[PDB]
Design an enzyme around this catalytic site. Sequence first.
Site, mmCIF file in Angstrom:
data_model
loop_
_atom_site.group_PDB
_atom_site.id
_atom_site.type_symbol
_atom_site.label_atom_id
_atom_site.label_comp_id
_atom_site.label_asym_id
_atom_site.label_seq_id
_atom_site.Cartn_x
_atom_site.Cartn_y
_atom_site.Cartn_z
ATOM 1 N N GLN A 25 0.814 -1.219 0.000
ATOM 2 C CA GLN A 25 0.000 0.000 0.000
ATOM 3 C C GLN A 25 0.847 1.269 0.000
ATOM 4 O O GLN A 25 0.506 2.242 -0.674
ATOM 5 C CB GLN A 25 -0.979 0.016 1.179
ATOM 6 C CG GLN A 25 -2.126 1.007 1.004
ATOM 7 C CD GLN A 25 -2.909 1.248 2.278
ATOM 8 O OE1 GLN A 25 -2.643 0.638 3.317
ATOM 9 N NE2 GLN A 25 -3.889 2.145 2.204
ATOM 10 N N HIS B 201 1.357 3.678 -3.675
ATOM 11 C CA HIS B 201 0.755 5.007 -3.612
ATOM 12 C C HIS B 201 1.705 6.154 -3.989
ATOM 13 O O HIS B 201 1.393 7.333 -3.765
ATOM 14 C CB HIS B 201 0.111 5.228 -2.242
ATOM 15 C CG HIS B 201 -1.216 4.550 -2.087
ATOM 16 N ND1 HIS B 201 -1.456 3.267 -2.533
ATOM 17 C CD2 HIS B 201 -2.374 4.976 -1.529
ATOM 18 C CE1 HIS B 201 -2.707 2.937 -2.267
ATOM 19 N NE2 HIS B 201 -3.284 3.956 -1.654
ATOM 20 N N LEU C 286 -6.028 -3.428 -10.943
ATOM 21 C CA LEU C 286 -5.579 -4.753 -10.511
ATOM 22 C C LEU C 286 -4.905 -4.740 -9.139
ATOM 23 O O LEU C 286 -4.850 -5.766 -8.460
ATOM 24 C CB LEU C 286 -4.650 -5.349 -11.582
ATOM 25 C CG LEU C 286 -3.560 -6.395 -11.309
ATOM 26 C CD1 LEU C 286 -3.325 -7.226 -12.559
ATOM 27 C CD2 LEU C 286 -2.258 -5.736 -10.837
ATOM 28 N N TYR C 287 -4.392 -3.584 -8.728
ATOM 29 C CA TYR C 287 -3.604 -3.513 -7.498
ATOM 30 C C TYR C 287 -4.452 -3.242 -6.259
ATOM 31 O O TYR C 287 -3.914 -3.076 -5.163
ATOM 32 C CB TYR C 287 -2.504 -2.459 -7.614
ATOM 33 C CG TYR C 287 -1.121 -2.957 -7.250
ATOM 34 C CD1 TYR C 287 -0.061 -2.820 -8.146
ATOM 35 C CD2 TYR C 287 -0.866 -3.562 -6.019
ATOM 36 C CE1 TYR C 287 1.215 -3.270 -7.829
ATOM 37 C CE2 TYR C 287 0.415 -4.020 -5.695
ATOM 38 C CZ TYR C 287 1.447 -3.866 -6.609
ATOM 39 O OH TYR C 287 2.715 -4.301 -6.314
ATOM 40 N N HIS D 42 -7.233 -5.119 -1.370
ATOM 41 C CA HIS D 42 -7.877 -4.929 -0.069
ATOM 42 C C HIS D 42 -8.214 -6.215 0.704
ATOM 43 O O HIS D 42 -8.436 -6.141 1.917
ATOM 44 C CB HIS D 42 -9.103 -4.024 -0.219
ATOM 45 C CG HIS D 42 -8.764 -2.653 -0.712
ATOM 46 N ND1 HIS D 42 -8.402 -2.404 -2.018
ATOM 47 C CD2 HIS D 42 -8.701 -1.463 -0.070
ATOM 48 C CE1 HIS D 42 -8.135 -1.118 -2.161
ATOM 49 N NE2 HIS D 42 -8.307 -0.525 -0.993
ATOM 50 N N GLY E 109 -0.300 -8.821 -13.958
ATOM 51 C CA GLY E 109 0.400 -7.939 -13.032
ATOM 52 C C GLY E 109 1.884 -7.807 -13.298
ATOM 53 O O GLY E 109 2.424 -6.704 -13.244
ATOM 54 N N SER F 54 4.370 -4.517 -13.605
ATOM 55 C CA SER F 54 5.251 -4.400 -12.448
ATOM 56 C C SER F 54 6.742 -4.322 -12.818
ATOM 57 O O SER F 54 7.422 -3.384 -12.424
ATOM 58 C CB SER F 54 4.986 -5.547 -11.472
ATOM 59 O OG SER F 54 5.714 -5.382 -10.270
HETATM 60 C C1 HEM Z 1 -7.145 -0.541 5.921
HETATM 61 C C2 HEM Z 1 -6.331 -0.110 4.950
HETATM 62 C C3 HEM Z 1 -6.871 0.541 3.649
HETATM 63 C C4 HEM Z 1 -7.768 1.536 3.545
HETATM 64 C C5 HEM Z 1 -8.485 2.272 4.699
HETATM 65 C C6 HEM Z 1 -7.965 1.822 2.137
HETATM 66 C C7 HEM Z 1 -8.817 2.778 1.615
HETATM 67 C C8 HEM Z 1 -8.869 3.188 0.299
HETATM 68 C C9 HEM Z 1 -9.693 4.249 -0.260
HETATM 69 C C10 HEM Z 1 -10.686 5.129 0.537
HETATM 70 C C11 HEM Z 1 -9.436 4.326 -1.577
HETATM 71 C C12 HEM Z 1 -10.076 5.303 -2.601
HETATM 72 C C13 HEM Z 1 -11.121 4.549 -3.430
HETATM 73 C C14 HEM Z 1 -12.457 5.260 -3.506
HETATM 74 O O1 HEM Z 1 -12.997 5.683 -2.448
HETATM 75 O O2 HEM Z 1 -12.995 5.396 -4.638
HETATM 76 C C15 HEM Z 1 -8.443 3.314 -1.891
HETATM 77 C C16 HEM Z 1 -7.908 3.062 -3.135
HETATM 78 C C17 HEM Z 1 -6.809 2.288 -3.430
HETATM 79 N N1 HEM Z 1 -6.291 1.254 -2.649
HETATM 80 FE FE1 HEM Z 1 -6.700 1.121 -0.564
HETATM 81 N N2 HEM Z 1 -7.149 0.967 1.412
HETATM 82 C C18 HEM Z 1 -6.463 0.171 2.305
HETATM 83 C C19 HEM Z 1 -5.556 -0.809 1.974
HETATM 84 C C20 HEM Z 1 -4.976 -1.019 0.744
HETATM 85 C C21 HEM Z 1 -3.981 -2.022 0.419
HETATM 86 C C22 HEM Z 1 -3.373 -3.056 1.390
HETATM 87 C C23 HEM Z 1 -3.666 -1.902 -0.874
HETATM 88 C C24 HEM Z 1 -2.650 -2.787 -1.637
HETATM 89 C C25 HEM Z 1 -1.616 -2.262 -2.298
HETATM 90 C C26 HEM Z 1 -4.457 -0.816 -1.421
HETATM 91 C C27 HEM Z 1 -4.436 -0.370 -2.727
HETATM 92 C C28 HEM Z 1 -5.174 0.674 -3.245
HETATM 93 C C29 HEM Z 1 -4.916 1.347 -4.500
HETATM 94 C C30 HEM Z 1 -3.783 1.046 -5.499
HETATM 95 C C31 HEM Z 1 -6.006 2.425 -4.622
HETATM 96 C C32 HEM Z 1 -6.210 3.448 -5.764
HETATM 97 C C33 HEM Z 1 -5.265 4.631 -5.551
HETATM 98 C C34 HEM Z 1 -5.609 5.799 -6.447
HETATM 99 O O3 HEM Z 1 -6.403 5.645 -7.411
HETATM 100 O O4 HEM Z 1 -5.077 6.907 -6.198
HETATM 101 N N3 HEM Z 1 -5.248 -0.308 -0.404
HETATM 102 N N4 HEM Z 1 -8.127 2.635 -0.729
HETATM 103 C C1 LIG Z 2 8.441 -13.191 -10.822
HETATM 104 C C2 LIG Z 2 7.709 -12.329 -11.857
HETATM 105 C C3 LIG Z 2 7.088 -13.150 -13.001
HETATM 106 O O1 LIG Z 2 7.044 -12.587 -14.115
HETATM 107 O O2 LIG Z 2 6.610 -14.277 -12.735
HETATM 108 C C4 LIG Z 2 6.579 -11.496 -11.234
HETATM 109 C C5 LIG Z 2 6.630 -10.118 -11.410
HETATM 110 C C6 LIG Z 2 5.632 -9.309 -10.883
HETATM 111 C C7 LIG Z 2 4.570 -9.865 -10.181
HETATM 112 C C8 LIG Z 2 3.599 -8.984 -9.705
HETATM 113 C C9 LIG Z 2 2.251 -9.200 -10.004
HETATM 114 C C10 LIG Z 2 1.280 -8.307 -9.555
HETATM 115 C C11 LIG Z 2 1.654 -7.180 -8.826
HETATM 116 C C12 LIG Z 2 2.997 -6.948 -8.540
HETATM 117 C C13 LIG Z 2 3.969 -7.844 -8.985
HETATM 118 C C14 LIG Z 2 4.507 -11.252 -10.013
HETATM 119 F F1 LIG Z 2 3.488 -11.818 -9.335
HETATM 120 C C15 LIG Z 2 5.512 -12.069 -10.540
#
Ligand code: HEM
Ligand SMILES: C[C@@H](C(=O)O)c1ccc(-c2ccccc2)c(F)c1
Lengths: 553, 553
Positions: free
Chosen positions: B172, B176, B353-354, B357, B495, B499
């Site tokens: 996370q 970000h 894809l990322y 949650h 992914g 990535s």
């Molecule tokens: C308890 C912890 C977390 C909270 C409270 C949270 C909350 C949120 C919120 C409020 C949004 C905006 C989406 C919307 O309201 O339309 C969001 C988006 C997103 N979340 Fe989380 N999230 C959490 C954990 C995670 C985790 C573990 C990941 C994994 C990497 C993640 C990845 C993302 C991504 C990539 C976005 C979109 C970012 C963007 O468009 O700027 N989140 N999340």
């Molecule tokens: C090891 C390598 C591969 O091409 O298999 C690889 C590379 C990237 C990811 C990956 C997939 C989703 C989000 C972030 C990383 C993954 F899961 C595996």
Amino acid sequence: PVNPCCYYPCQHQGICVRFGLDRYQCDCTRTGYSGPNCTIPEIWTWLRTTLRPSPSFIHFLLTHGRWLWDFVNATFIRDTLMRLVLTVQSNLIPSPPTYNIAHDYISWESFSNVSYYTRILPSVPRDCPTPMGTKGKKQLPDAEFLSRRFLLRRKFIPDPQGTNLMFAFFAQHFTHQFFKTSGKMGPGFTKALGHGVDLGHIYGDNLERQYQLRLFKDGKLKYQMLNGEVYPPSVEEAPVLMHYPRGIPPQSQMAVGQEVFGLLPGLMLYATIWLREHNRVCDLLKAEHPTWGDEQLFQTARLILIGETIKIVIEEYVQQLSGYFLQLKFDPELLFGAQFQYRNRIAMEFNQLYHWHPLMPDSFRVGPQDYSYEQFLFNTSMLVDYGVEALVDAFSRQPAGRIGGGRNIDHHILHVAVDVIKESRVLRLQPFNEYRKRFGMKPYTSFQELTGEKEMAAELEELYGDIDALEFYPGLLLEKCHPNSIFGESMIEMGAPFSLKGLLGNPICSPEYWKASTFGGEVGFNLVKTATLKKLVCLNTKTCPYVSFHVPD
Amino acid sequence: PVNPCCYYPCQHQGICVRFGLDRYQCDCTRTGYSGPNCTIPEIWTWLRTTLRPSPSFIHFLLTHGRWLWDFVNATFIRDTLMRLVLTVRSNLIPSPPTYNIAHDYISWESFSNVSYYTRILPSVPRDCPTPMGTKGKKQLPDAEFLSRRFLLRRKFIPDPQGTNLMFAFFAQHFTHQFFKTSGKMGPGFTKALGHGVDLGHIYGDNLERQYQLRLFKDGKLKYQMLNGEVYPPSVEEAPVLMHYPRGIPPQSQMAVGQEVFGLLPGLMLYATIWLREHNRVCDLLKAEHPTWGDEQLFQTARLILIGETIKIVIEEYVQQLSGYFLQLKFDPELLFGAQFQYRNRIAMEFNQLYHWHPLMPDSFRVGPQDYSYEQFLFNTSMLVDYGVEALVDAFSRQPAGRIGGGRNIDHHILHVAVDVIKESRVLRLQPFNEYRKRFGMKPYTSFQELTGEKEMAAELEELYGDIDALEFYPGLLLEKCHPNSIFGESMIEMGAPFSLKGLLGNPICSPEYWKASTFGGEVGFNLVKTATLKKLVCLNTKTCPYVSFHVPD
Ligand code: HEM
Ligand SMILES: C[C@@H](C(=O)O)c1ccc(-c2ccccc2)c(F)c1
Ligand SMILES: *[C@@H]1O[C@H](CO)[C@@H](O[C@H]2O[C@H](CO)[C@@H](O[C@@H]3O[C@H](CO[C@H]4O[C@H](CO[C@H]5O[C@H](CO)[C@@H](O)[C@H](O)[C@@H]5O)[C@@H](O)[C@H](O)[C@@H]4O)[C@@H](O)[C@H](O)[C@@H]3O)[C@H](O)[C@H]2NC(C)=O)[C@H](O)[C@H]1NC(C)=O
Ligand code: HEM
Ligand SMILES: *[C@@H]1O[C@H](CO)[C@@H](O[C@@H]2O[C@H](CO)[C@@H](O[C@@H]3O[C@H](CO)[C@@H](O)[C@H](O)[C@@H]3O)[C@H](O)[C@H]2NC(C)=O)[C@H](O)[C@H]1NC(C)=O
Ligand SMILES: *[C@@H]1O[C@H](CO)[C@@H](O[C@@H]2O[C@H](CO)[C@@H](O[C@H]3O[C@H](CO)[C@@H](O)[C@H](O)[C@@H]3O)[C@H](O)[C@H]2NC(C)=O)[C@H](O)[C@H]1NC(C)=O
Ligand SMILES: *[C@@H]1O[C@H](CO)[C@@H](O[C@H]2O[C@H](CO)[C@@H](O[C@@H]3O[C@H](CO)[C@@H](O)[C@H](O)[C@@H]3O)[C@H](O)[C@H]2NC(C)=O)[C@H](O)[C@H]1NC(C)=O
Ligand SMILES: *[C@@H]1O[C@H](CO)[C@@H](O[C@H]2O[C@H](CO)[C@@H](O)[C@H](O)[C@H]2NC(C)=O)[C@H](O)[C@H]1NC(C)=O
Ligand SMILES: *[C@H]1O[C@H](CO)[C@@H](O[C@H]2O[C@H](CO)[C@@H](O)[C@H](O)[C@H]2NC(C)=O)[C@H](O)[C@H]1NC(C)=O
Ligand SMILES: CCCCCCCCO[C@@H]1O[C@H](CO)[C@@H](O)[C@H](O)[C@H]1O
């Protein structure tokens, strides 16, 4: 302790880094050399050194042997050598880019912030004995005096290569899409963020400006009708910022992509032709894509015009410039097998180098009329008075000045060269002889060897104190020309790397973009492939004048 | 008449272009195919396709047969395979980037304007009969209802690969910096203009902000001492826009590079660790370079940190995620022999894809304490109350949720998953099966084949009507997981290309940048080369806690 890096103690592109208080080290990584200063060659580098002929010898090969080059151009050797010229020269230019005015080292700010010009060599450190390093006098020569005594035109020295004003105005037009030094931010900063052939001198360097210039119908740019001919629109119809003399009525102010293009008829000439080409391209696209919106029509025409520009610049513009018997060839597919980065960052050195003001004449002969500088500059009716046909004919016939050699800038615009030298001291550009080594040439040992004569050299010796102190822009414009050529070896060996990287580094040349679909199909793709200066003009005019980058016969 | 491109006729990355009124043409250029739809394979392509084993088979070899892998990892074959992983994966990503929300075609504006996320497949044309093209129902299934039935957690499902909250929070945090969607500009637009690992979540996405974070002494970032430990400064000292709940005053709120990190202690945890590291690096850099100013110290520390981030992510983060027996390696030199563009543009699909949650637990355990979401979310004191050591130990011991498989998003954050689907539809993202084909996989022929079960599949078939109407995100999350894995076939195969292109496409990985001088010499270079998650924490703390991307045993 004085700064050791000011001796430029490292050869062949090694990086000088200060360590401790009075020490330095050099990072010879991938320079081909080893040792403290990077002067011990690896077995491959060494082998290539003795087998490498001098740039002068190769220049001779490219400018001689009519019979051999007729054979070469009709075979695959053409492609082989073009590939060779492309990769070898472009690779002198770093990519991603390295330094800027603020950073003499690689940083994330230098990579990301595109408002900076880049640099190939770092600035001369501030904490050093002389302003050019360690060699030379405490103060540099007066910039006005260097121009007056060495650069000021007495008699007009024409170009022996046959270059005309149609070339000079193309050069000036073309280059000003990627040279837009900013007044507010200062020297070493730029407004043209495309950093290459984006055609932002036609469409604008920003979205707002572009939207104001667009008709928003059929993908076209706005235009006006004067005497039955299509011209760019008045500022009243496209309310963009244009630099015109205060007091001039808005109805006689024409709006184009570039702010300064209204000040000279030659500029506003090309601005018209390209605009008239853009809408023409929309007419061809729309016939084959009735379902396409305005945005698709516009964006596709832009790409076709980006292609056309590079096709003409490489195969016609650089051709006339180089004087080579090698028929130069625009084919992005050539580089599809090599390691090449499709990105570019405009450099201050290339900005300094591209000040080709000696091309400008004493007067401007249009038909029986002769026009003074005070009749040509700022004149807003001349273009509409004569028309495209008549002005293109007049510019293709009048010769342009010889760039190198010396004493060939008409007094009216000498002040530019003065400020160029001035700017080349705020930016702390390294001395000419350091650039000689960076672009793979031997440094000059004397001012005699530089000019090839005795008189003008001996006076430079007294002023500069040392050849190792000679500045960049004065070096380029005072160096002896190649026999019967437009400028010296340094302009070619330093200019072309920048030039070619810009052209071929454009995204449209990438394996991803160089497709038929990108330009709306075969029709659009062929428009790029068969583009021509003569076609750029005569397909957009009622009659076809003499149009060329060189004087008749 | 119905738009022909709605059927997606062009296979294998061929580009559909409308001609005339109802006609279409495919541009098969360099796809490996010929013919009207790009289905006729060239001699080499056929060879390639018949000899190439299925993705699931490769996943088997990589995750089984440990004896063979012990041998492989201790030989050059480690470098050979890694290169193959790098080159074959990243190739699936267009570079320079292709499309964006405004243009479903190549344009200069798409290339120039870094405010846009890019995309790999064009949007579903607005004139298509159904929302997904030609297949499915007139209206898509309710987004809220889809989350409740298929994505909402009942009982907690731990990741079988042993992935912990130390990973979940790193993910996370790390993501970000390049996922910052603009609320004021709308979906498909981004504030993270570095488009990769620029560390703009530590230094901020803009210069004026970065400046406010910086001490401007010794290249260091601003900080405050609390309980004897180093923590990010208050907003009172570094005035930057931070997103804190209405009522939380500036002295109570901490300032970092990313505006939203105050909302979660886990996010603010890593803000601390990376800040300590930055300042720790500066101390090393000053001992080697006493003559260095503030600016050079900061810029170099940034590159070393970017270096360390990429090293850790590739060799530990991706390792735990992939579960491969191949010892993954960070060495930019692997790519110095192949055609690779050191440029990156973040795609809307990578964003979609990322949304991992499911990783988030039912509640957060910190030793003997069990904190609920309402205690954890927006806690201002938890970080300072416990310290870095204690919370690294805590998150490293607690299991994270299995991402794929279904029914594993805690109800507190289920609204996120709802909005992702709603956003997808605005983005007009192509069907899941269309994305299967684009990442070298065969499309699913049924919902049963997707899920690997009967019940959930039957209900989905009723809602969607056809498998070819199934959406991107729901598809990725409801797919059968690889035996004992964190997610399914598609998350890896879709992914990975995004990535690895993001990591290795970083300019610091370029042959121009990848040298000692870039990191102030050998000490800085080795910090990158020997970087480690354990070290990142433990070199900046008084004691070592348990630190890992997986739970103990
Ligand atoms: C308890 C912890 C977390 C909270 C409270 C949270 C909350 C949120 C919120 C409020 C949004 C905006 C989406 C919307 O309201 O339309 C969001 C988006 C997103 N979340 Fe989380 N999230 C959490 C954990 C995670 C985790 C573990 C990941 C994994 C990497 C993640 C990845 C993302 C991504 C990539 C976005 C979109 C970012 C963007 O468009 O700027 N989140 N999340
Ligand atoms: C090891 C390598 C591969 O091409 O298999 C690889 C590379 C990237 C990811 C990956 C997939 C989703 C989000 C972030 C990383 C993954 F899961 C595996
Ligand atoms: C990257 O790309 C994004 C997305 O395009 C871009 O976003 C913003 O920029 C655009 C353009 O500025 C905004 O688009 C809106 O455009 C409409 C245009 O409709 C009007 O067109 C006529 C001209 O309007 C008037 O202009 C001036 C100012 O008043 C004046 O000379 C005249 O009064 C003239 O009439 C006109 O017929 C009429 O007004 C039409 O309504 C505008 O109305 C609107 O205000 C915007 O300008 C986007 O809204 C911006 N945001 C988004 C989210 O799209 C980025 O700028 C770009 N980034 C970079 C770095 O380039
Ligand atoms: C009669 C025609 C010309 C006039 C009146 C003219 C005048 C000028 C002026 C006033 C400047 C800016 C000086 C300053 O304030 O720093 C300038 C800069 C420049 N000139 Fe010319 N010049 C002419 C012809 C040319 C030609 C033929 C070229 C060849 C390409 C050229 C190349 C340049 C370049 C590249 C710059 C710097 C642009 C920038 O950085 O913004 N000029 N010239
Ligand atoms: C802010 O987050 C902090 C996390 O520290 C919360 O404060 C802490 O809350 C716990 C209870 O949930 C306190 O535990 C208490 O003390 C002992 C353990 O030391 C425990 O055995 C008792 O049962 C008792 O609950 C903990 O001490 C306390 N810390 C401080 C400094 O007060 C706080 O609740 C969070 N904010 C919100 C809105 O939840
Ligand atoms: C704007 O461009 C105009 C050229 O298109 C130019 O006006 C032209 O100037 C010439 C030379 O002064 C005029 O020729 C006059 O002088 C000759 C004697 O040398 C007489 O034989 C002619 O009858 C005539 O009076 C042109 O007549 C005139 N062209 C037009 C169409 O009016 C201007 O010089 C440029 N603007 C400025 C402000 O200088
Ligand atoms: C690309 O680089 C430009 C130069 O670094 C930058 O321009 C600006 O840089 C800074 C920060 O905004 C400003 O410097 C000053 O900051 C001090 C703070 O004490 C003030 O006293 C002073 O008033 C001034 O703001 C400059 O004003 C400004 N311009 C220049 C020429 O330095 C650009 O912002 C940057 N571009 C991007 C997109 O980040
Ligand atoms: C590397 O370059 C340095 C600096 O140019 C050389 O150091 C010397 O250079 C002068 C000319 O050879 C000597 O007179 C000085 O004693 C000394 N000067 C400085 C500033 O260090 C050094 O010899 C070079 N080494 C090699 C192997 O070529
Ligand atoms: C590939 O292109 C189209 C689109 O998939 C194929 O389908 C067309 O022809 C088929 C009849 O033989 C039908 O499936 C469809 O009516 C028709 N689709 C459209 C949109 O017109 C077609 O088989 C392929 N074309 C070729 C030349 O093989
Ligand atoms: C012994 C195991 C060999 C693994 C090294 C080869 C890595 C190839 O990785 C391959 O990437 C392709 C493109 O993304 C996918 O289509 C394949 O399924 C994937 O495995």
